[PDB]
């Protein structure tokens, strides 16, 4: 202790000097006495002795933690409060008490000067480089912005952006629903104001998005996207006055909403939204098959792929209601540009559909193999 | 944890003159579940298992599932490979994950890592089954050309609703074989080329319906006689457009040099059949 206080008196990188320091608490046999001795020795700092005191409160730190006498830290501790209150407060020595705190070895518990570092012009200044060469140091201030200083998120850039991503989610979900919280008919009145709620609403869930993909939130960033794009299709219904809307469907009204717009261009937001898996032969019987408008097939088509066994049912669904003589071109409105051979070789024979019948089994080449189709 | 890491050494200090095998086997596997906790530690998690909630083993797939719901693909994979608990599964997972977002440059990078695709070339089956679904997730919405860039971003409502309305035009405008050409037909194709193989590559490109470049791979890949036997008739016998078909299987060589067997075999799927009556014109 005497040799380290003299080494100490004589020098009154940073990094560097830190085996200086331990090669000598080397020399001990068992660490804890000479953390004994230490920690008696500090109270011999010199009158103004601030520069190498703090190395000599620094190593009592590094000396008590790597055996772990719980008692000796508490005492530790105090000694670091009293560092910082007793000399370190008059002195104002910024950069000593950065070290220092960043020496803190139970930084965990370092809210004498938490608040202290915002309040001392460190909250922008924690952002300095080469300050983390464990990468500790910026943890710890993420760790700050979140619990110590929450709402600047200046700061919290300079320094979860999943907790940014959930706390825009969130505002936009508030907002959302205070549209929802009143009727319809009271709420459609206000028009300007629910475009400009849906475009807040929208902000904020981009905003979650965004957050989340800084936050590599893949799928939320995704689900946040999804209420955007339900918030814009509502902003379009109350700017653009399409009373027949598809947000904050439930499973029930998301059949009315796909009501609203029913063509497959127009519908497909409100299943997209609300997770809602139309039904595709019963909805299907409306789309085209008893009205033609393979239009919104193909709306469809351009926007998904219905399989062959789908064509082959959907005779069930336009069977399962009264099909007029027009349900049968209307459903056949997308069977030019086909190929399907055995499905719809049986449906043929299921209603005797002479039409397509002649349409594929006559040519020669094609009407020898409509054999290995149907009968085949 | 320190002092519990430390607790437990001291705990085999005292296992090692006892002589008992099964004991120091026991306090190795407390060890582990020390280590584990700590591993955990290193997340700081929502909740947290006991070391009895840990001596079980089923608590372990218990937490590769858990994680799995709370998204923390890396931290949760590093933690369970660590474990001993394996997780192709967890990185497929966060593939479809990002799927649904578009990170696919990342997300590529990071399954490329975990591929595990079927040596066999001549995989007829789903070989990597993780490549059988995520072909499916991928190309169930592609981005044809449609006039507006994956960078149209203050589009207002208005020009939301217009795109409502002009919707059907990104996809239909794509052509049979932009079907094949997309930049996301060319990574999905990456993706194939990654974990999967052409008898796939033909379906993926019929049901888009992209034909030529298909031919010109199956070709380049040699579609096998077989290959051409099956997916050739089995489909021709469910679609007979062939009109095309023999045409491009003689535009594979119309002297009838390099074009040899591949309707060959489809005509022994056919007449061995008893199918011939289009065989003639074929």
Redesign the interface.
Known sequence: AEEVTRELLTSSNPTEESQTFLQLTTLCQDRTLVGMKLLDKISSVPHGELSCTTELLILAHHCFTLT?HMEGIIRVLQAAHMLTDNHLAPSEEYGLVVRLLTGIGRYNEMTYIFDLLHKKHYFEVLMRKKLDPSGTLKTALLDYIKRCRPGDSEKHNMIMCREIGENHEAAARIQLKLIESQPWEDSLKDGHQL?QL?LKALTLMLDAAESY?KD???????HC?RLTKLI??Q??FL??G?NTMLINLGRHKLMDCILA?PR???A??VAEAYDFVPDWAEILYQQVILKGDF?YL??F?????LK?SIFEEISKKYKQHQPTDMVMENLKKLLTYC?????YYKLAYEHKFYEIVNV?LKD??????????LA? | T??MKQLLFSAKMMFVKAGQSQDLALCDSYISKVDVLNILVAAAYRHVPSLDQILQPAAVTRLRNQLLEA?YYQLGVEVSTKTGLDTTGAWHA?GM??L????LTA?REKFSRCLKPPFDLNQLNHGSRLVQDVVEYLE?TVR?FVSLQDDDYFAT??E??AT???????????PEGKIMNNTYYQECLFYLHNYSTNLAIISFYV??SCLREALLHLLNKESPPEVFIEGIFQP????????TLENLLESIDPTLESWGKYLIAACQH?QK?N?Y??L??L
């Open positions: 772990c475009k849906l993909a590599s939130c893949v799928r939320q960033a995704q996207q814009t299709l902003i379009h700017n653009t399409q717009l497959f261009y127009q497909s937001i239009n193909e709306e088509k351009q926007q998904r792929l062959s190929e399907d051979v055995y499905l594929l020669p080449q094609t009407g020898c193999c409509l054999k290995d189709m085949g | 320190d002092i998204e966060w994950a990002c649904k977002a578009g990170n997300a169930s044809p409502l208005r939301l609703e409502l309305r002009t919707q059907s035009l990104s996809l239909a405008v794509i049901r888009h021709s016998y469910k679609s007979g457009k062939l009109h056919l059949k199918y009556h289009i003639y014109e």
